[model samples]
Target: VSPPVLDMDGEPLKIDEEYSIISIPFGGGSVYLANLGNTKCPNGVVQDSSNKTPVLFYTMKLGSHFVSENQDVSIKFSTKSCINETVWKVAYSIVGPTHSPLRFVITGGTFGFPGPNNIENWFKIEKYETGRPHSYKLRYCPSQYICPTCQFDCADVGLYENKGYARLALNNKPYPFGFSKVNKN
Candidate 1:
């Protein structure tokens, strides 16, 4: 039929194309990190981690969802992928998530800054720690009439010590608060 898809490194990916894997570079020994999965919003996709063959996060879908015959994807790593090499501003590659891949990570303002107020973007592999505890939040504007999405933070629940790779979760359990609107003036 069609030529099979492959990893930039050469191995072709199938159901799970590529995952963002980082290592504890601090260690001279071999190390492949992995992330924990969610209990709230599973879509029959589960990534397991172990000391033997660990993974940080796996592509939730197949490469067909991301491959393009017209353009070449650079197949880069980092929180920032698919950046324009020439003009070099800042750009990224995105795909539709039937289920949101976001969960609370680290603290409340780390991943994508919590802002319609100018929250910026940042990424990493490993560091000793932040100067202080950093947080990740999904903050939104207060309602002009009636705001819909309520605000939430990740630090309230699990963590890297308990969970690995402090990133947001996928398949979050439906928040019980119905009408689910931000009610404030």
Candidate 2:
């Protein structure tokens, strides 16, 4: 199946530009896009020495589709650079076909680094749907820290440790989501 189309006002976004869409099945959802090349601007905003900038953007329109219940949908955008940096702002409205009204909104930020490069960071507002537009934000920093050792084996040290950090806030309150466990095959 073809990916859903995304647009800004009356124009379509360039394929080379970065963008994404996510939805929770069985619920109303949202979509977000960033950095698009268009006629108004042939080339997108240049990345600084750090290679980060906002180019083009858009948000989802309510009642666009029906989300299936209990399904978590997620989408990720990739930049030309191996390491990508970005800031995200999102607002969600949660109204069912027939249900009581609920409203929740939150805003936060995040930073992230695509792996194989070994560096990544991200902070984001917690996801919640309460029948109203919930505002949120995310900022990503792909190269926040420099790893000293490359491919170092720690299993023989008698002490094994995996160091990482993350934070999420809901309705301006901190919330514990879960662990970030992964297997490096």
Candidate 3:
């Protein structure tokens, strides 16, 4: 099957602004889209309302129908990060299930960026499983901060005040998507 297509208005994503598309289908499977960019206050900001740093949005499309017993499926998306004249690109893909929830493991950390001194990192998907009420945990590690030579750890660090994370609860309950300031430790 052909890969799905996504279109964003020419508007550039800011620090806390996010755009989303819901219920997209590919090869008899459907998924949702949540675009993360700069905006502030609610969705995209990481640490606090004051600390407005650039963050990568988590683009995910999940469903239980991918595990149907009579079908096989696949899903993927291309991601690009651009700043001024610099551009970085990466392609991500996962196989879908016909009878169970489709699960993917992200190995590489952040996509490469253009700079004189660039830092590279990697990630691992832990405690992954799928069910009627499915849950997944995504974790990654990095060794740098926004400020050069700043004595701070970036990965698995504490959260800043005023900032918040994103979540999609099954039945309108509150479930953290790893970007919460209140729960950050």
2 or 3, which is superior by TM-score?
Answer: 3
- Alpha carbon lDDT of residue 165, candidate 1? 30
Give the alpha carbon lDDT tens digit for every residue of 1-185 in model 3: 32222112222222122223211111111112222334231222121211222223322224331112111112112222232211111112232243332112211223343122432222221222333112222232222342356452222211211113221211112111221111112
Top lDDT model: 2
Q: What is the Å distance of residue 178 in model 2 from its true position?
A: 16
How close is each model in CA RMSD to the real structure?
A: 19.1, 18.9, 17.4
Off by over 4 Å in 3: 1-117, 120-122, 128-134, 142-185
- Lowest summed lDDT across 10 adjacent residues in model 2 is found at 156-165
Most TM-score-accurate candidate = 3
Write model 2 residue lDDT over 1-185, tens digit each, in one string: 22223232212333234433222222322232223323232121111111222222222224334211111112223333323333332222344465433222112213323233422211222333333332222222122223444442111000011111111111233221111111112
- State model 1's lDDT: 0.23
Whole-model Cα lDDT of every candidate shown, in order? 0.23, 0.24, 0.23
Tell me model 3's lDDT, rounded to 2 decimals.
0.23
lDDT of 1 by residue, 4-107 (tens): 33232333333223333222222212122233355332211111222222212222234355322111122222222212211101111132344323433221
What TM-score against the true fold does each predicted structure earn? 0.20, 0.18, 0.22
